Amino acid sequence: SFSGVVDIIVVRQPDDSLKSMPFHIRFINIQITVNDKKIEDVFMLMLPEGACYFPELNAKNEIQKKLRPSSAILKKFNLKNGYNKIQFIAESDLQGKQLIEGKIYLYNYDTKLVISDVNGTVTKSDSTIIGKEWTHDDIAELYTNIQKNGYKMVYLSSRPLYFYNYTQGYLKGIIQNGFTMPDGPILLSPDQIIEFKGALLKDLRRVFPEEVNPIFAGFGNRDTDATACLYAGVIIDNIFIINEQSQVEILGKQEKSSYKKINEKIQELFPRLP
């Protein structure tokens, strides 16, 4: 079974509160350290099946099992903008101290995200693996240049949770002509953590305030990817769908292209943010 933490996304609101996506962690009290500092007065508990949660009282004074911590708890993390190291430490009287490590990202309310499917969109095709999946040409250079203009790449996986750590290793090992894949969270479809892609992106959209549109563009390889992005606030002009021949359709302009050509027009399609 899985041991680790799905990448966590936290967003600072314009009133300075914090909202986050659900914490999915798997290995009794659980303590937290962020950027190698122990966080005081924060703890999680664990269900029999191994999933962990934040205990929170409801108005009837019953303990509710929350995956989304309150803003006050999140403020105690002292998160920095961007990537942060997070470790969860489960203490058991029978099995001792157990530690898992993951990634927690802090964005601002005006941060702009660019979504990328992994399988079929990064890999060329959509249980026995060695990490040698072929990668579409030129995708690392393009995504690098998107990130350099101020956007944040967010990766999406629909593979089972057993493959999550493998997917992270696969993306961080890609090297194309010296270019690498920009670091960013890998979100996991909630069906794999026991219409799902569209529910996930709407969840992500909703940790940002309603008066901004945080998801700027999306890269996919199926028509269902396009629908998921549209209903999460991406304009059709900014949805890119690639096929197994590495031909990219820019849906809005009904244009055919490629990662290489999109990269040529990077300042047109992904203009630099201030």
Numbering used by the authors: 20 to 46, 57 to 155, 161 to 228, 242 to 321
Copy text from the publication.
Lipin/Pah phosphatidic acid phosphatases (PAPs) are Mg2+-dependent enzymes that catalyze the dephosphorylation of phosphatidic acid (PA) to produce diacylglycerol. pmcLipin/Pah phosphatidic acid phosphatases (PAPs) are magnesium-dependent enzymes that are evolutionarily conserved from yeast to humans. They catalyze the penultimate step of triacylglycerol synthesis, through the conversion of phosphatidic acid (PA) to diacylglycerol (DAG). Structurally, all lipin/Pah PAPs contain highly conserved N-Lip and C-Lip regions that combine to form two domains: an immunoglobulin-like (Ig-like) domain and a HAD-like catalytic domain. The remainder of the C-Lip adopts a Rossmann-fold, forming the haloacid dehalogenase-like (HAD-like) domain and harbors a conserved catalytic motif DxDxT, where the first Asp coordinates a Mg2+ ion that increases its nucleophilicity, and the second Asp participates in acid/base catalysis.
Mutating polar residues in the active site to nonpolar equivalent residues has been demonstrated to stabilize HAD phosphatases, enhancing structure resolution. The Δhelix D148N point mutant was crystallized in an apo state, Mg2+-bound, and Mg2+ tungstate-bound states by crystal soaking. The Δhelix D148N structures were crystallized without any cofactors and then soaked with either magnesium, or magnesium and tungstate to generate three structures with active sites in distinct states. Comparison of the apo and magnesium bound structure saw replacement of a water molecule with a hexa-coordinated magnesium ion in the active site, characteristic of a HAD phosphatase. The sixth and final magnesium coordination site was occupied by the carboxylic acid group from the sidechain of Asp155 and was located distal to the catalytic Asp146 on the opposite side of the magnesium ion. In the apo structure, Asp155 was observed in a similar conformation but coordinated the water molecule in place of the magnesium.
